[PDB]
Design an enzyme around this catalytic site. Structure first.
Site, short mmCIF file in Angstrom:
data_model
loop_
_atom_site.label_atom_id
_atom_site.label_comp_id
_atom_site.label_asym_id
_atom_site.label_seq_id
_atom_site.Cartn_x
_atom_site.Cartn_y
_atom_site.Cartn_z
N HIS B 60 0.84 -1.19 0.00
CA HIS B 60 0.00 0.00 0.00
C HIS B 60 0.88 1.25 0.00
O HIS B 60 0.45 2.30 -0.49
CB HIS B 60 -0.94 0.01 1.22
CG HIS B 60 -1.63 -1.29 1.53
ND1 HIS B 60 -1.57 -1.90 2.77
CD2 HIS B 60 -2.43 -2.06 0.74
CE1 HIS B 60 -2.29 -3.03 2.73
NE2 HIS B 60 -2.84 -3.14 1.48
N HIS B 86 5.81 7.12 6.22
CA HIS B 86 5.53 6.48 4.95
C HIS B 86 5.18 7.56 3.94
O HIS B 86 5.21 8.76 4.25
CB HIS B 86 4.37 5.47 5.06
CG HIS B 86 3.09 6.11 5.50
ND1 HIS B 86 2.78 6.38 6.81
CD2 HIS B 86 2.05 6.55 4.74
CE1 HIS B 86 1.60 6.98 6.85
NE2 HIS B 86 1.12 7.09 5.58
N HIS B 88 3.10 8.61 0.03
CA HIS B 88 2.07 8.46 -0.98
C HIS B 88 2.56 9.16 -2.25
O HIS B 88 3.13 10.25 -2.17
CB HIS B 88 0.74 9.01 -0.46
CG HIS B 88 0.26 8.43 0.85
ND1 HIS B 88 -0.65 7.41 0.92
CD2 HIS B 88 0.56 8.77 2.15
CE1 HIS B 88 -0.90 7.11 2.19
NE2 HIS B 88 -0.16 7.95 2.98
N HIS B 111 4.02 11.14 5.28
CA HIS B 111 3.31 11.18 6.55
C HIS B 111 4.22 10.65 7.66
O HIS B 111 4.86 9.62 7.48
CB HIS B 111 2.03 10.34 6.47
CG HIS B 111 0.97 10.91 5.58
ND1 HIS B 111 -0.13 10.24 5.10
CD2 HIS B 111 0.92 12.18 5.07
CE1 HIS B 111 -0.85 11.07 4.35
NE2 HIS B 111 -0.22 12.28 4.31
N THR B 192 -6.32 7.58 6.53
CA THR B 192 -6.71 7.54 5.14
C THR B 192 -6.67 6.11 4.62
O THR B 192 -6.51 5.90 3.41
CB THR B 192 -5.81 8.43 4.29
OG1 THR B 192 -4.59 7.70 4.13
CG2 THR B 192 -5.55 9.80 4.89
N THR B 193 -6.78 5.13 5.53
CA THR B 193 -6.87 3.72 5.17
C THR B 193 -7.66 3.01 6.27
O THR B 193 -7.62 3.43 7.42
CB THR B 193 -5.50 3.04 5.01
OG1 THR B 193 -4.78 3.04 6.25
CG2 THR B 193 -4.61 3.68 3.96
C1 LIG Z 1 -5.02 -1.01 13.57
C2 LIG Z 1 -3.83 -0.17 13.33
C3 LIG Z 1 -2.93 0.57 13.04
C4 LIG Z 1 -1.82 1.49 12.67
N1 LIG Z 1 -2.07 2.44 11.53
C5 LIG Z 1 -2.96 2.44 10.48
O1 LIG Z 1 -3.86 1.53 10.28
C6 LIG Z 1 -2.86 3.61 9.54
C7 LIG Z 1 -3.57 3.97 8.40
C8 LIG Z 1 -3.25 5.15 7.69
C9 LIG Z 1 -2.20 6.04 8.07
S1 LIG Z 1 -1.99 7.41 7.10
N2 LIG Z 1 -2.21 7.03 5.51
O2 LIG Z 1 -0.95 8.35 7.46
O3 LIG Z 1 -3.12 8.05 7.74
C10 LIG Z 1 -1.48 5.66 9.27
C11 LIG Z 1 -1.74 4.45 10.05
S2 LIG Z 1 -1.12 3.78 11.44
O4 LIG Z 1 -1.41 4.49 12.67
O5 LIG Z 1 0.27 3.38 11.55
ZN LIG Z 2 -0.58 8.16 5.00
#
Ligand SMILES: CC#CCN1C(=O)c2ccc(S(N)(=O)=O)cc2S1(=O)=O
Ligand SMILES: [Zn+2]
Ligand SMILES: CC#CCN1C(=O)c2ccc(S(N)(=O)=O)cc2S1(=O)=O
Ligand SMILES: [Zn+2]
Lengths: 251, 251
Positions: B60, B86, B88, B111, B192-193
């Site tokens: 991802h 990470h 994007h 991020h 955002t996931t």
């Molecule tokens: C369950 C669990 C967990 C940890 N993280 C995520 O799922 C996620 C998704 C998006 C991001 S993002 N694309 O920066 O918002 C960061 C994380 S995380 O905190 O490391």
């Molecule tokens: Zn992110």
């Protein structure tokens, strides 16, 4: 622990010597206008006469237990539900608000305590940022009997003993608060008694609320605290900001 | 879950249908200047070569797991500790940032995900006010090459496969971010996931970071995601503010 009379509060609770404590001194010209502070939203506060609400003397204040369904929002999706409210007050001739404005301490102060809907219990919320939110308003002396507060003050005599409690009929809780819900100060602080848990969002109304002298007197003079002793001057000295900038919803 | 096909994200996580999601479109025109937003402060970001850090292609994104000891404060009493960072990105001649500014999408976005020091782990923080915080910066095309990013970009070949990882020496994590910590946008949003939990504080730098054109090609071109397809355009669709106001640390 007791108000005015050791033990010292860090001895009983080291949290009370944290850097971000409450209450504090609000200096409105050093406050920061933050246009994103929208008007407070308070739904469900207009309670019917039944059920009745528990009003207790806990020896540190008078406390009303609010039922489920009082919902409050500090911002979009930043919602809370009210748990209880209580008061802080001086003695005859002497003020006892917790918060002060440019040094000025007000005759008394109402605190309405709320729990983030993100937390199921208070004890999960304690110490966590935003977990609890208090709406504070100042009470001053004005020329008229305040009928919203009379509903409580007229019941103070029945619970004068520390530890005693009574059932009062439901009241409109919002009637105890100021007029403009768009004008307030906000900072992050703590409980103002032990355990002095930090992370409490404090919203202090810009506007006061007015009680008669018979009503302020009734507030300080009716209640008995710990020992053969009066329940009075139940506030905490203002605490340093330690770099915290108080925000204002208005210019 | 993936970007482009099924499963639909609300079927995976209910919170991905929340009202207050990320990323958003930052219109500086409508941002509320808020002089309480002071400069961000990092500590322990300047890491030595050992221990080494795990860099992973999770299919991802490319994700660098950060060690203990990296402290970040959004302001007095708003303290976090870094978990990972990470990226994007887009594709050839296509921008890939998650956040846009007045509709403009930038080549890529870094991020840096942080955990409130009030929570021992991420599952406790998800959905809670201020529980997680992300620092975002946009990466633009630049004339001279970025030597901080070359440390990571040169290792992407080794994790081309999806689900593969390598170990890389530590580095100044802060040199992967702009030098101006005083000028930023801040808003409350989501991940955002999936699970897309709300209550997350997004700080978006207005200063960009500059990568040579080849570096941007290295990022967008090197990695492979699910199936026999490149890992590209790994950004989420801009989400409506739905009444939220973005703040700005500057007038
Ligand atoms: C369950 C669990 C967990 C940890 N993280 C995520 O799922 C996620 C998704 C998006 C991001 S993002 N694309 O920066 O918002 C960061 C994380 S995380 O905190 O490391
Ligand atoms: Zn992110
Ligand atoms: C432990 C525990 C608990 C509950 N609370 C308190 O002790 C306390 C003290 C002061 C206040 S005050 N002055 O509103 O902050 C509120 C609370 S509480 O959350 O209801
Ligand atoms: Zn109180």
């Amino acid at each position: 622990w007791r108000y005015g009379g050791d033990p010292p509060w860090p001895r009983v609770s080291p949290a009370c010597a944290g850097r971000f404590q409450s209450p504090v001194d609000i200096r409105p010209q050093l406050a920061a206008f933050s246009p994103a502070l929208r008007p407070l939203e308070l739904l469900g506060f207009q309670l019917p006469p039944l059920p009745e609400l528990r009003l207790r003397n806990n020896g540190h204040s008078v406390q009303l237990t609010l039922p489920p369904g009082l919902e409050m929002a500090l911002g979009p999706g930043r919602e809370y539900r009210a748990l209880q409210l209580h008061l802080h007050w001086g003695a005859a001739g002497r003020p006892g608000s917790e918060h002060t404005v440019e040094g000025h301490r007000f005759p008394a102060e109402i605190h309405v305590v709320h729990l983030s809907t993100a937390f199921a219990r208070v004890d999960e919320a304690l110490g966590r940022p935003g977990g609890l939110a208090v709406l504070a308003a100042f009470l001053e002396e004005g020329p008229e009997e305040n009928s919203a507060y009379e509903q409580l003050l007229s019941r103070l005599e029945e619970i004068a003993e520390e530890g005693s409690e009574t059932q009062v009929p439901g009241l409109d809780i919002s009637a105890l608060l100021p007029s403009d819900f768009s004008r307030y100060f906000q900072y992050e602080g703590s409980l103002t008694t032990p355990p002095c848990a930090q992370g409490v969002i404090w919203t202090v109304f810009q506007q006061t609320v007015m009680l008669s002298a018979k009503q302020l007197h009734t507030l300080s003079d009716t209640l008995w605290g710990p020992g053969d002793s009066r329940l009075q001057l139940n506030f905490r000295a203002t605490q340093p900001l330690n770099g915290r900038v108080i925000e204002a919803s208005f210019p």
